[PDB]
Scaffold this active site. Structure first.
Site, PDB file in Angstrom:
ATOM      1  N   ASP A  85       0.795  -1.458  -0.023  1.00 14.86           N
ATOM      2  CA  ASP A  85      -0.432  -0.120  -0.365  1.00 14.86           C
ATOM      3  C   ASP A  85       0.750   1.400   0.350  1.00 14.86           C
ATOM      4  OD1 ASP A  85       0.888  -0.391   2.795  1.00 14.86           O
ATOM      5  OD2 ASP A  85      -0.851   0.511   3.364  1.00 14.86           O
ATOM      6  N   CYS A  98       5.675  -1.968  18.870  1.00 14.60           N
ATOM      7  CA  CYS A  98       4.834  -2.008  17.637  1.00 14.60           C
ATOM      8  C   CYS A  98       4.562  -3.173  17.303  1.00 14.60           C
ATOM      9  CB  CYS A  98       5.716  -1.717  16.549  1.00 14.60           C
ATOM     10  SG  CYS A  98       5.551  -0.946  14.755  1.00 14.60           S
ATOM     11  N   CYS A 127       9.387   1.681  16.941  1.00 13.51           N
ATOM     12  CA  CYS A 127       9.373   1.334  15.535  1.00 13.51           C
ATOM     13  C   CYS A 127       8.437   2.754  15.041  1.00 13.51           C
ATOM     14  CB  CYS A 127       8.452   0.560  14.720  1.00 13.51           C
ATOM     15  SG  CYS A 127       8.889  -0.519  14.518  1.00 13.51           S
TER      16      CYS A 127
HETATM   17  C1  LIG Z   1      -0.136  -5.955   7.054  1.00  8.67           C
HETATM   18  C2  LIG Z   1       1.264  -4.986   7.374  1.00  8.67           C
HETATM   19  O1  LIG Z   1       2.731  -5.491   6.922  1.00  8.67           O
HETATM   20  N1  LIG Z   1       1.418  -3.735   6.969  1.00  8.67           N
HETATM   21  C3  LIG Z   1       2.699  -2.926   7.300  1.00  8.67           C
HETATM   22  C4  LIG Z   1       2.621  -2.374   6.351  1.00  8.67           C
HETATM   23  O2  LIG Z   1       3.835  -3.290   4.663  1.00  8.67           O
HETATM   24  C5  LIG Z   1       1.980  -0.658   5.861  1.00  8.67           C
HETATM   25  O3  LIG Z   1       2.548  -0.685   4.551  1.00  8.67           O
HETATM   26  C6  LIG Z   1       1.536   0.105   6.401  1.00  8.67           C
HETATM   27  C7  LIG Z   1       0.267   0.975   6.376  1.00  8.67           C
HETATM   28  O4  LIG Z   1      -1.087   0.048   5.914  1.00  8.67           O
HETATM   29  O5  LIG Z   1       1.700  -0.840   7.783  1.00  8.67           O
HETATM   30  C8  LIG Z   1       2.020  -1.641   8.576  1.00  8.67           C
HETATM   31  O6  LIG Z   1       3.449  -1.372   8.798  1.00  8.67           O
HETATM   32 MG   LIG Z   2      -5.291   2.512   3.082  1.00 11.47          MG
HETATM   33 ZN   LIG Z   3       7.540  -2.003  13.549  1.00  9.60          ZN
END
Ligand SMILES: CC(=O)N[C@H]1[C@@H](O)[C@H](O)[C@@H](CO)O[C@@H]1O
Ligand SMILES: [Mg+2]
Ligand SMILES: [Zn+2]
Ligand SMILES: Nc1ncnc2c1ncn2[C@@H]1O[C@H](COP(=O)(O)OP(=O)(O)O)[C@@H](O)[C@H]1O
Ligand SMILES: Nc1ncnc2c1ncn2[C@@H]1O[C@H](COP(=O)(O)OP(=O)(O)O)[C@@H](O)[C@H]1O
Ligand SMILES: CC(=O)N[C@H]1[C@@H](O)[C@H](O)[C@@H](CO)O[C@@H]1O
Ligand SMILES: [Ca+2]
Ligand SMILES: [Ca+2]
Ligand SMILES: [Cl-]
Ligand SMILES: [Cl-]
Ligand SMILES: [Mg+2]
Ligand SMILES: [Zn+2]
Lengths: 308, 308
Positions: A113, A175, A182
């Site tokens: 994302d 975290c 983090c």
């Molecule tokens: C489900 C998961 O592993 N999410 C991570 C990261 O990969 C995402 O980019 C972030 C923002 O949604 O959340 C978390 O930091």
């Molecule tokens: Mg979103």
């Molecule tokens: Zn983290």
């Protein structure tokens, strides 16, 4: 028909599906909570995509493909979600391309994302034309995406730009990734929500002029003079700033784009931390708030639109 | 003649000039302290290079050019030292190419010392053939170098890979760069030297079996059971480890090379911090100690050897 994409965004809280035009207009968007189990989640993605595809016909949009933005480490070449933190449970070694392409008879792209956010900023936003830039998207979690030589860096094991898990303390808050210190553990929506909920539990958030508690409550309280809320938000913003300093001293991008609704609240503190702590050679870095409504969803669409 | 390079390395303590063969053998090396002023420093570089060039003739080495490794932000295209932290005073907006090329009648390359370290690891070391790797070189300061798609990342303002100024605390010890909480402020030679000197000041370093105080004293004391020394070295190594975690979650390289004499002392703690804190998708990262005697000096030579 208007050439369009179906776009899916799966975050820490919400699952959204949209019809997006080739100009980056969100024609229609459906929103549900992201279910907490695999079976429910995959079924809801499919349901929502089938319904969106049917509405697209009624709205005269010609869907060219499906792009999926998801939290987690992703192999975009194979369309597999490799590993997720607990922000999305039961989301490990998941082939998304097969079930979606079989159900909808469309090609399917999948990326993390934050990486989609970068792609949106490159196509529709302030990253257009730039050789190098980084984005941090604040939501439930914090996502990142890195463009270098005009293209995403995915890393040797698809774990580049996990920028929410930059560490800025030897100790620090826990975290959800299982680490501590983090930037996500300080500055994400989930982190602020927790800190707001903690104050509200101790009758310590509300202040004359306000009255389900979240990040925006903490920020409202801070504008209205709540000292504990201001201090929490300063700590949060300083942590994010230090994350950005790490990025500057690592990649030295020309531009950092902050996105998500919290971006506007953090940009001044991030700029101040850079000013006060980063090397003089990165002081010319531009730090901006995104002008896009929904980078991840737009970036999921951009994979379809640019590659179909 | 043996095809060779003249190589210069300008660090936080020492100025070294060497004749290096095209196979990476240091034929002869001269060492002096790096002077503290510009006029003295430039004059000594020139002196040492002229003398090395004359000896090269007597050693039957054919010098093809001069490569310069230096602390500071550098524009390698123009051969200019742009900005330095106070580890090298009076070292700002300095054209090194002109005076060296005019004096020696040789082409001259210049880069940051961590970037040279990376180039050495790419040509002679464990980075050979790899698309992506990062190196951290511990000396007086901590230097970094990033290879991505087989090539150095210099960044939009020549400040990429200033890895000693990754920040791993909201507070933390002051760094010579003017920040605080930088990995260099915890884990560099200068940082350990200071902490050793502080203990020795309070009669708290020496222990049965030892007797000008520096980093190696702190490490010796720690092997011989000094509790305060072990604790300082654990903190130092944890900080460096967290720097590495930031790198992994940013770039996600296949290999991290630690170099400088302290590398051997830190590698196990760095590996432990990665194990305990980084995401599962970077756990397959290889972390090694460099097999090269002097990466910066070798990397300065490699610029001549590969590009002349
Ligand atoms: C489900 C998961 O592993 N999410 C991570 C990261 O990969 C995402 O980019 C972030 C923002 O949604 O959340 C978390 O930091
Ligand atoms: Mg979103
Ligand atoms: Zn983290
Ligand atoms: N208008 C808003 N401003 C700031 N934070 C918000 C807003 N709406 C939701 N949030 C917070 O952001 C998270 C949900 O945002 P969203 O971007 O939909 O997240 P995700 O991609 O993580 O599902 C929650 O932490 C919530 O408190
Ligand atoms: N054999 C050694 N082992 C560990 N540290 C050393 C050694 N020799 C010197 N140092 C430390 O490293 C610094 C000098 O190392 P060097 O690599 O020559 O530095 P620079 O490139 O910073 O001039 C000083 O902090 C000194 O205490
Ligand atoms: C003089 C100066 O600015 N040195 C920096 C950095 O550029 C170096 O690479 C590092 C190691 O020498 O020390 C310091 O961190
Ligand atoms: Ca990412
Ligand atoms: Ca460097
Ligand atoms: Cl859980
Ligand atoms: Cl000084
Ligand atoms: Mg050196
Ligand atoms: Zn520093």
């Amino acid at each position: 028909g208007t050439l369009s994409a179906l776009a899916v965004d799966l975050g820490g809280t919400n699952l959204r599906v949209a019809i997006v035009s080739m100009k980056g207009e969100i024609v229609k968007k459906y929103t549900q909570f992201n279910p907490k189990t695999y079976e429910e989640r995959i079924n809801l993605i499919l349901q929502m995509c089938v319904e969106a595809a049917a509405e697209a016909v009624k709205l005269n949009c010609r869907i060219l493909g499906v792009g999926i933005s998801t939290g987690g480490r992703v192999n975009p070449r194979e369309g597999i979600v490799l590993h997720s933190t607990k922000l999305i449970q039961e989301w490990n070694s998941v082939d998304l391309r097969t079930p979606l392409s079989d159900t909808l008879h469309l090609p399917v792209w999948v990326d993390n994302d934050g990486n989609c956010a970068a792609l949106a900023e490159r196509k529709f936003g302030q990253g257009k034309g730039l050789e190098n830039f980084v984005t941090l998207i604040t939501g439930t979690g914090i996502g990142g995406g890195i463009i270098h030589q005009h293209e995403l860096i995915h890393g040797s094991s698809f774990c580049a730009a996990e920028l929410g898990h930059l560490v800025v303390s030897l100790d620090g808050p826990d975290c959800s990734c299982g680490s501590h210190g983090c930037i996500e553990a300080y500055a994400s929506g989930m982190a602020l929500q927790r800190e707001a909920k903690k104050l509200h539990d101790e009758d310590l958030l509300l202040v004359e002029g306000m009255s389900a508690v979240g990040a925006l409550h903490l920020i409202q309280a801070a504008k209205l003079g709540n000292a504990k809320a201001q201090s929490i938000l300063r700590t949060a913003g300083t942590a994010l700033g230090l994350g950005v300093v790490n990025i500057l001293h690592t990649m030295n991008p020309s531009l950092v784009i902050l996105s998500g609704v919290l971006a506007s609240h953090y940009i001044h503190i991030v700029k101040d931390v850079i000013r006060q702590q980063a090397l003089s050679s990165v002081q010319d870095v531009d730090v901006v708030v995104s002008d896009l409504v929904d980078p991840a969803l737009l970036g999921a669409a951009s994979m379809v639109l640019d590659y179909t």
